[PDB]
Design a protein around this ligand. Structure first.
Ligand SMILES: CNC(=O)[C@H](Cc1ccccc1)NC(=O)[C@H](CC(C)C)[C@H](CSc1cccs1)C(=O)NO
Ligand SMILES: [Ca+2]
Ligand SMILES: [Ca+2]
Ligand SMILES: [Zn+2]
Ligand SMILES: [Zn+2]
Length: 158
C-alpha cells in the first residue's frame, strides 16, 4: 500500500485546456484538492513553477508515459500512485470537451477522482463512491466526499 510519508504536498498545473478559462481550470483543481483535505491530514500548496510533487497536465494520445490516450470519450484521464517522479502525477485527455456544468465532461469531478489515485486509493465497487471506475455527473455546487471515499483515505492516513 503506497502512501506519501509527508503531509504538505505541492502541485503544479503545467498547461491548460482552451475550453475553460485559466481561472476556471484553477478553481476546478483547487476545489478537488479541498475535498480530500477536509477528510485527511494532507495540505496541498500550489507552486507556479519548479518541481511539484503532483504535476497536472492536459495531453493527447502518446505523451511519453506508455499509457496513451484514445481521443474523444473512452478513457478521460489517469493518475499515478504516490511516489517519486511520475509518482502522484495526473494527466487529462486534451481531446475531451471539458466543462464546469452538467454537460460532458465536468473537469472538477474527473479531477477529484484522479487525485484519489495520486493519494493512494484504488477503485471502489460502490457505484455511489467517487472512486467508482465510470464517470457519472452529480451536483457540484456544494459537493462533498461520499462516505465510502472518506473510509478510504482515513484507512491509509488518518
Ligand atoms: C465516460 N468514460 C469513462 O467513464 C471511462 C471509461 C473507462 C474506465 C475504466 C477503464 C477503461 C475505460 N472512465 C475513465 O476515464 C476513468 C475516470 C473517470 C471516473 C473520471 C479512468 C479510466 S482509465 C483506468 C482504468 C483502470 C485504472 S485507470 C480512471 O480511472 N482514471 O483514473
Ligand atoms: Ca510526481
Ligand atoms: Ca479519451
Ligand atoms: Zn499519461
Ligand atoms: Zn480511476
Amino acid at each position: 500500500n503506497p502512501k506519501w510519508e509527508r503531509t504538505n504536498l505541492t502541485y503544479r498545473i503545467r498547461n491548460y485546456t482552451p475550453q475553460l478559462s485559466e481561472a476556471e481550470v484553477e478553481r476546478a483543481i483547487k476545489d478537488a484538492f479541498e475535498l480530500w483535505s477536509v477528510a485527511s491530514p494532507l495540505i496541498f500548496t500550489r507552486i507556479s513553477q519548479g518541481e511539484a510533487d503532483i504535476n497536472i497536465a492536459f495531453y493527447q494520445r502518446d505523451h511519453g508515459d506508455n499509457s496513451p490516450f484514445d481521443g474523444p470519450n473512452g478513457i478521460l484521464a489517469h493518475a499515478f500512485q504516490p511516489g517519486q517522479g511520475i509518482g502522484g502525477d495526473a494527466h487529462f485527455d486534451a481531446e475531451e470537451t471539458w466543462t464546469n456544468t452538467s454537460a460532458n465532461y465536468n473537469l472538477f469531478l474527473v479531477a477529484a477522482h484522479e487525485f484519489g489515485h495520486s493519494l493512494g486509493l484504488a477503485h471502489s465497487s460502490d457505484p455511489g463512491a467517487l472512486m467508482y471506475p465510470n464517470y457519472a455527473f452529480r451536483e457540484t455546487s456544494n459537493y462533498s466526499l461520499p462516505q465510502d471515499d472518506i473510509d478510504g483515505i482515513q484507512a491509509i492516513y488518518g
